[PDB]
Amino acid sequence: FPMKQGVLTHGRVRLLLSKGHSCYRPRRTGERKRKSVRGCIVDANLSVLNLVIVKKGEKDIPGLTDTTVPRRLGPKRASRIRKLFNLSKEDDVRQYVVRKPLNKEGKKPRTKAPKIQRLVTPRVLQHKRRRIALKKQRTKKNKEEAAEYAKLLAKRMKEAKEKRQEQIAKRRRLSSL
């Protein structure tokens, strides 16, 4: 049973674990499960204990510090590439991407690069342009429809008012007798 931070016991408690909790991955959304976890206090009754070296001494443990393994993936986001190579805004990102050689037997030695995300590109400029363009038609559409309806409302009231004034003029005259 794994250890869980914050339990504060030398033994094993059962907790109602949800999403984001350690020692548990839900099989479907909103699922909770009760699982047995061991507290954060280290005792003798442990099978394996995990240690993370924060400070390195003068000596050298074989295996641990003899060699260094590289990061398996280069940055993808454009800002991440810029941050890695401390590039300024007015610089190109395409040439400064990490390219990973591929050296499997049989197939000739090719190279692969990640697709940079979050980068201004001719498409992003257009897509932003098309968004602004749709804002225009909508503003133009509003104006025309409100303009056209202004005429029709004006004309209809004129017809209604004239008839309303026409019949009252008729009733007033016949009321003279």
Question: Least distance (Å) from other proteins to the CB of residue 15?
Answer: 23
Which partner, Mg ion, other proteins, RNA, none, binds residue 28 by CB below 5 to 8 Å per kind? RNA
Tell me the two tokens of residue 19.
Answer: 């999403």
Q: Which is nearer to Mg ion, 39 or 114 (by Cβ)?
A: 114
Residues that contact other proteins, how many (by CB under 8 A): 7
Of 121-160, which residues contact other proteins (CB under 8 A)? 145-146, 148-149, 152-153, 156
**Which residues, 6+ apart, have CB-to-CB distance to 138 below 8 Å?**
none
Q: Which residues bind Mg ion (CB under 5 A)?
A: 117
Nearer to Mg ion, 103 or 117 (CB): 117
Cα distances (Å, whole numbers) of residue 25 to 75, 152, 170 = 27, 64, 86
Q: Are 127 and 114 in contact (CB under 8 A)?
A: no
**Shortest distance in whole angstroms from residue 168 CB to RNA:** 13
The secondary element (H helix, E strand) that includes residue 33 is strand 33-38
Residue with smaller CB distance to RNA, 51 or 174: 51
Cα separation, 153 vs 148, whole angstroms: 9
> Closer CB to Mg ion, residue 35 or residue 76?
76
Q: How far is the CB of 153 from other proteins (least distance, A)?
A: 6
For residue 159, the minimal CB distance to Mg ion (Å) is 32
- Return the SS3 of 95: helix
Task: Quote the least distance from Cβ 150 to other proteins, whole Å.
Answer: 9
Burial 141-157 (b: 16+ CB within 10 A, else e): eeeeeeeeeeeeeeeee
Give the residues lining the site for other proteins (CB under 8 A). Answer: 145-146, 148-149, 152-153, 156
